[PDB]
């Protein structure tokens, strides 16, 4: 029936550390900076975005506007028909980006911390530039399941599979880490984009690009900037040791979130 | 038709996960995904000659059954066994002429009064799908009840409960690899227990998941959609992303822009 006809809906924007797209101070005079924020339970305007089918992010009526086209700019609400055209125009991609088409500079958050003006910076697939439009807060704890029906498991600086007893949950955010959840501020890392670095545990606090994970429709869990997945190395559980490579979509490198 | 065999006899979590991707590969053609995620053809425009795939299920005993699946929703509409064939009451005019095209060969074809919905088949079963157990051992058992509904050794209330086990290992399973995981586990451990209340909760969602994603703003959906944890608690879910590694099929809603 019809073609299909896509709405604007009005929701949230999470991204690094869980913390939400903000309007800064509640005002919206033009050029007032957008930030990162504890999310908020309420109807406050200046936390929440429609996004409209033009392209263009919308807080209280006004646009989400970029500064300019350089590596580096923050970006800023603004009067929608005042500002340039195309600088209030972005896409949300599956895999958490939300880009500028036009300089391909992506909303990022250089910082962590409470009150970090937004920016658009080059795309490298970070988690310091990872978003999710949504009105869910909180982050998703699940099992991840594996080779032999094994559980992913974490045990301090290190990540390995073993037997599923039912810590091996893991919370996955916004800013598209994985995240062990009983130490929420250390991500599922990868030191290198090298063929076989061995994935471990240290602190989200660099967000880097060996940080960010995606769940693919195959069963893997792909490392965006490096284009390699999760795998079990030589299909040995024993080893206990977590790999990057290249895919070739053997039992070793399908993994299922199990909720 | 295509057809596509499994067989209880040897099941194993690779044969298993075999005949699933085999059946995921039949369904779709690869032309149309969206967000990722494979959509079933469209069913306006859809030659009879690529409406149907057949699947033939055999166990231990040596029995055999040859279930058939409608294409455009994963659907499985009647089946054959032996000389005979049992289709589920058609619900449009459209598909009752479509069914007339299975099983030509057989010289018994009858259609029940009732329809493969599971709120009818639950019904007839006596049971709720939260209360009939899955596994290879039911598989089995269900086609063996499903082989000897021909032969009259069958009563109604077992050939329903037989029909839930099917619909759910298999279309289910292609469906959501969820569902499938949720099967091979099952298999893998030898275990015969009743689907969780995520996995229900996935089955009654299929279509509006379908619609939500596909005419979503970008990943985003306009309503949330409501899902379960296996413990029975719920969570909302409003974007597509999450879903990326949970649903493998999509029913056809719309066009793209
Ligand atoms: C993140 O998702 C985007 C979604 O478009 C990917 O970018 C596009 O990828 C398709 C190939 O599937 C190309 O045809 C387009 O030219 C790409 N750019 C755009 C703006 O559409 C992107 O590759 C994904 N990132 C990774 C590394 O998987
Ligand atoms: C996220 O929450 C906000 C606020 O609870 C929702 O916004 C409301 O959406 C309805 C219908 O779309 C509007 O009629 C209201 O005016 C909105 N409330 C406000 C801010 O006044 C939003 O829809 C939710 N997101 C989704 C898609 O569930
Ligand atoms: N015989 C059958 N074959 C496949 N699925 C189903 C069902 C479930 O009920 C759903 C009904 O979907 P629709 O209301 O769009 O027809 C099916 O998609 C499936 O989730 N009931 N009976 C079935
Ligand atoms: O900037 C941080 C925080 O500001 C809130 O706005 C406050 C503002 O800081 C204060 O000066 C004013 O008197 O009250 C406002 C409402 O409490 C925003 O509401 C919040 O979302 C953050 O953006
Ligand atoms: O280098 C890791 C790589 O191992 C492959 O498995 C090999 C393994 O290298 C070695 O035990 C020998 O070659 O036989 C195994 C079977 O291929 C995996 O196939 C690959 O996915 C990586 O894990």
Redesign the pocket.
Request: charged share 15%.
């Given at each position: 029936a019809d073609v299909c006809m896509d709405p604007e809906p009005i929701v949230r924007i999470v991204g690094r550390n869980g913390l939400c797209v903000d309007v800064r101070d509640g005002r919206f005079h033009n050029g007032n900076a957008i930030q990162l924020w504890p999310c908020k339970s309420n109807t406050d305007a200046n936390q929440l975005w429609t996004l409209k089918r033009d392209n263009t992010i919308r807080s209280n009526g006004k646009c989400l506007t970029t500064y300019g086209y350089s590596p580096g700019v923050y970006v800023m609400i603004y009067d929608c028909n005042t500002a340039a055209t195309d600088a209030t125009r972005w896409?949300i991609?599956?895999?958490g980006?939300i880009?500028n088409?036009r300089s391909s500079l992506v909303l990022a958050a250089t910082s962590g911390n409470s009150g970090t003006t937004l920016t658009v910076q080059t795309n490298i697939?970070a988690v310091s530039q990872g978003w999710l439009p949504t009105n869910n807060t909180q982050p998703f704890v699940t099992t991840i399941v594996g080779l032999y029906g094994l559980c992913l498991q974490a045990n301090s600086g290190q990540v390995w599979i073993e037997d599923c007893s039912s810590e091996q949950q893991w919370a996955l955010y916004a800013d598209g880490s994985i995240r062990p959840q009983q130490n929420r501020d250390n991500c599922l890392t990868s030191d290198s984009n090298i063929r076989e670095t061995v994935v471990k545990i240290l602190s989200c606090g660099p967000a880097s690009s060996g940080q960010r994970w995606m769940f693919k429709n195959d069963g893997t869990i792909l490392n965006?900037y490096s284009?390699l997945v999760l795998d079990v190395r030589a299909s040995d559980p024993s080893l206990k040791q977590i790999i990057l490579y290249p895919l070739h979509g053997d039992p070793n490198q399908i993994w299922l979130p199990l909720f | 038709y295509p057809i596509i065999n499994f067989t209880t006899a040897g099941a194993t979590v690779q044969s298993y996960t075999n005949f699933i991707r085999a059946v995921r590969g039949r369904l779709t053609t690869g032309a149309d995904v969206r967000h990722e995620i494979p959509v079933l053809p469209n069913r306006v425009g859809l030659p009879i000659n690529q409406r149907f795939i057949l699947v033939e299920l055999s166990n231990h005993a040596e029995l055999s059954v040859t279930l058939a699946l409608d294409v455009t929703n994963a659907y499985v509409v009647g089946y054959r066994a032996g000389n005979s064939a049992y289709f589920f009451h058609p619900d449009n005019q459209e598909d009752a002429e479509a069914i007339t095209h299975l099983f030509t060969d057989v010289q018994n074809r009858y259609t029940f009064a009732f329809g493969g919905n599971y709120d009818r088949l639950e019904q007839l079963a006596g049971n709720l799908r939260e209360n009939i157990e899955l596994g290879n051992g039911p598989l089995e058992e269900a086609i063996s009840a499903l082989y000897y509904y021909s032969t009259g050794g069958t009563q109604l209330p077992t050939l329903a409960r037989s029909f839930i086990i099917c619909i759910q290992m298999i279309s289910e399973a292609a469906r959501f690899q969820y569902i499938e995981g949720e099967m091979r586990t099952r298999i893998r451990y030898n275990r015969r227990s009743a689907p969780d209340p995520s996995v229900i909760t996935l089955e009654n969602s299929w279509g509006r998941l379908s619609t939500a994603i596909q005419e979503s703003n970008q990943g985003a959906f306009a309503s949330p959609i409501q899902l379960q944890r296996r413990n029975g608690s719920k969570f909302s879910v409003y974007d597509v992303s999450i879903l990326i590694p949970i649903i493998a099929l999509m029913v056809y809603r719309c066009a793209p822009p």
């Amino acid at each position: 029936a019809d073609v299909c006809m896509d709405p604007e809906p009005i929701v949230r924007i999470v991204g690094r550390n869980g913390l939400c797209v903000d309007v800064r101070d509640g005002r919206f005079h033009n050029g007032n900076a957008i930030q990162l924020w504890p999310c908020k339970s309420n109807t406050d305007a200046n936390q929440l975005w429609t996004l409209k089918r033009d392209n263009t992010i919308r807080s209280n009526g006004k646009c989400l506007t970029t500064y300019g086209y350089s590596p580096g700019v923050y970006v800023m609400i603004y009067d929608c028909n005042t500002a340039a055209t195309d600088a209030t125009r972005w896409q949300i991609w599956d895999n958490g980006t939300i880009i500028n088409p036009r300089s391909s500079l992506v909303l990022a958050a250089t910082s962590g911390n409470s009150g970090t003006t937004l920016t658009v910076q080059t795309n490298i697939y970070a988690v310091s530039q990872g978003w999710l439009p949504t009105n869910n807060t909180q982050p998703f704890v699940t099992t991840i399941v594996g080779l032999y029906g094994l559980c992913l498991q974490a045990n301090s600086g290190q990540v390995w599979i073993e037997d599923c007893s039912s810590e091996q949950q893991w919370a996955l955010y916004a800013d598209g880490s994985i995240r062990p959840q009983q130490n929420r501020d250390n991500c599922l890392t990868s030191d290198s984009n090298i063929r076989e670095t061995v994935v471990k545990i240290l602190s989200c606090g660099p967000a880097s690009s060996g940080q960010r994970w995606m769940f693919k429709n195959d069963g893997t869990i792909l490392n965006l900037y490096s284009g390699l997945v999760l795998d079990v190395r030589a299909s040995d559980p024993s080893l206990k040791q977590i790999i990057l490579y290249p895919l070739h979509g053997d039992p070793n490198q399908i993994w299922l979130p199990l909720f | 038709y295509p057809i596509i065999n499994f067989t209880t006899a040897g099941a194993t979590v690779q044969s298993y996960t075999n005949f699933i991707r085999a059946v995921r590969g039949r369904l779709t053609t690869g032309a149309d995904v969206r967000h990722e995620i494979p959509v079933l053809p469209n069913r306006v425009g859809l030659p009879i000659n690529q409406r149907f795939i057949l699947v033939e299920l055999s166990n231990h005993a040596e029995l055999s059954v040859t279930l058939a699946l409608d294409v455009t929703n994963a659907y499985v509409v009647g089946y054959r066994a032996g000389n005979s064939a049992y289709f589920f009451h058609p619900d449009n005019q459209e598909d009752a002429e479509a069914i007339t095209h299975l099983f030509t060969d057989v010289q018994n074809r009858y259609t029940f009064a009732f329809g493969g919905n599971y709120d009818r088949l639950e019904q007839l079963a006596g049971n709720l799908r939260e209360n009939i157990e899955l596994g290879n051992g039911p598989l089995e058992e269900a086609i063996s009840a499903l082989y000897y509904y021909s032969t009259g050794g069958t009563q109604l209330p077992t050939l329903a409960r037989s029909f839930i086990i099917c619909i759910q290992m298999i279309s289910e399973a292609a469906r959501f690899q969820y569902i499938e995981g949720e099967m091979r586990t099952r298999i893998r451990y030898n275990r015969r227990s009743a689907p969780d209340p995520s996995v229900i909760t996935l089955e009654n969602s299929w279509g509006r998941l379908s619609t939500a994603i596909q005419e979503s703003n970008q990943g985003a959906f306009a309503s949330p959609i409501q899902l379960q944890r296996r413990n029975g608690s719920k969570f909302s879910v409003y974007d597509v992303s999450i879903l990326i590694p949970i649903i493998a099929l999509m029913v056809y809603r719309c066009a793209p822009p």
